[PDB]
């Protein structure tokens, strides 16, 4: 009009798109929903200090649609808005190094994210979306704000919302390369006989029902459709880790028999997570807080174990 500045729009913060904006109109009137490092500036008119800065927008043409899918591996229409909304919060969190790992200082009910982030740094896992690759690299270095906002966006969780570690890990594992992972199970019923099943990928590394990998190898009791209790046990495992999950229950964690674990104190509407890692001793990381003990007992929900190749001796 009479007065303009040059800004750049983006969906991935790498590929920039030159724009000339009218300082008399809001960003929303010109771009649609618009964000400046997570802050919603849709209703704001351009400032002088905005010249040359990069703004996120929603993927509103074909070029941006392709850039956003290639970077994030999602076409959920609300993804970018939810990522920006989360980032406006996570950029204000603190990410202390605790016993050599990036943690998160407690804020905004984020304890499930802290133990998920701590867990990732202890298992062998490679992400597929460049957005996660790039943000996870930064998180390992201690700048985890973008990674944490992406976890929230990928899980369709908002800042402050109750989260579950197992479900969160499931979303992240969908976006990781677990194609090599393989699990063979056998289920034995004294009435019906035996039935083997093979699982691949994410389903090959997660199990819900018991925390103990050794018990999974010996056999766990599950219902059979005939009504009797059958025994399910692990026949073969090919993966760099496994994750064993269960409803929270008092459970004893022995030094040297697991990699790390999550503990949940509370109920189905309200609770708090802590992280336990087995190193030279047992360390309990609760956000920024750190304690140690030689033995540990608590309401454990998830335990992670190292693996490479396992074959049963059960005939
Ligand atoms: Zn049966």
Swiss-Prot record:
It comes from the Viruses. Inhibited in vitro by GRL-0617. The active site is at residues 111, 272, 286. Residues 71-315 form the Peptidase C16 domain. It is found in: Host endoplasmic reticulum membrane. LRR repeats lie at residues 117-139. A zinc finger (C4-type) spans 189-226. Changing residue 145 to D: In strain: Alpha/B.1.1.7. Residues 2-57 form the Ubiquitin-like domain. Zn(2+) 6 binds at residues 189, 192, 224, 226. Responsible for the cleavages located at the N-terminus of the replicase polyprotein. Participates together with nsp4 in the assembly of virally-induced cytoplasmic double-membrane vesicles necessary for viral replication. Antagonizes innate immune induction of type I interferon by blocking the phosphorylation, dimerization and subsequent nuclear translocation of host IRF3. Also prevents host NF-kappa-B signaling. In addition, PL-PRO possesses a deubiquitinating/deISGylating activity and processes both 'Lys-48'- and 'Lys-63'-linked polyubiquitin chains from cellular substrates. May form homohexamers. Interacts with N protein. This is Papain-like protease nsp3. It comes from Severe acute respiratory syndrome coronavirus 2. The lineage of its organism: Viruses, Riboviria, Orthornavirae, Pisuviricota, Pisoniviricetes. The gene is rep. The chain holds residues 1564 to 1878 of 7096 of the full protein.
């Amino acid at each position: 009009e009479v007065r303009t500045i040059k800004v750049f729009t983006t969906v991935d913060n790498i590929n920039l798109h030159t724009q000339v904006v009218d300082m008399s109109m809001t960003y929303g009137q010109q771009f649609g929903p618009t964000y400046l490092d997570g802050a919603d500036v849709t209703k704001i008119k351009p400032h002088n200090s905005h010249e040359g800065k990069t703004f996120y927008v929603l993927p509103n043409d074909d070029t941006l649609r392709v850039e956003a899918f290639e970077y994030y591996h999602t076409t959920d229409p609300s993804f970018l808005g939810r990522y920006m909304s989360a980032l406006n919060h996570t950029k204000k969190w603190k990410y202390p190094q605790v016993n050599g790992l990036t943690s998160i200082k407690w804020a905004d009910n984020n304890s499930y994210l802290a133990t998920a982030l701590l867990t990732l740094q202890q298992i062998e896992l490679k992400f597929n979306p460049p957005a996660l690759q790039d943000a996870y690299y930064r998180a390992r270095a201690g700048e985890a704000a973008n990674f944490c906002a992406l976890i929230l966006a990928y899980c369709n969780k908002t800042v402050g919302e109750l989260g579950d570690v197992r479900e969160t890990m499931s979303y992240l594992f969908q976006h990781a390369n677990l194609d090599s992972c393989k699990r063979v199970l056998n289920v034995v019923c004294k009435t019906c006989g035996q039935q083997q099943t093979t699982l691949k990928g994410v389903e090959a590394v997660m199990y819900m029902g018991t925390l103990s990998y050794e018990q999974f190898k010996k056999g766990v009791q599950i219902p059979c459709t005939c009504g009797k209790q059958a025994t399910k046990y692990l026949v073969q495992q090919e993966s760099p880790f496994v994750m064993m999950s269960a409803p929270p229950a008092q459970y004893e964690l022995k030094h040297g028999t697991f990699t790390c674990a999550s503990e949940y104190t509370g109920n189905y509407q309200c609770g708090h997570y802590k992280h336990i890692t087995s190193k030279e001793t047992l360390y309990c990381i609760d956000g920024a807080l750190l304690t140690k003990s030689s033995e540990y007992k608590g309401p454990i929900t998830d335990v992670f174990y190292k693996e490479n190749s396992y074959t049963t001796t059960i005939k």
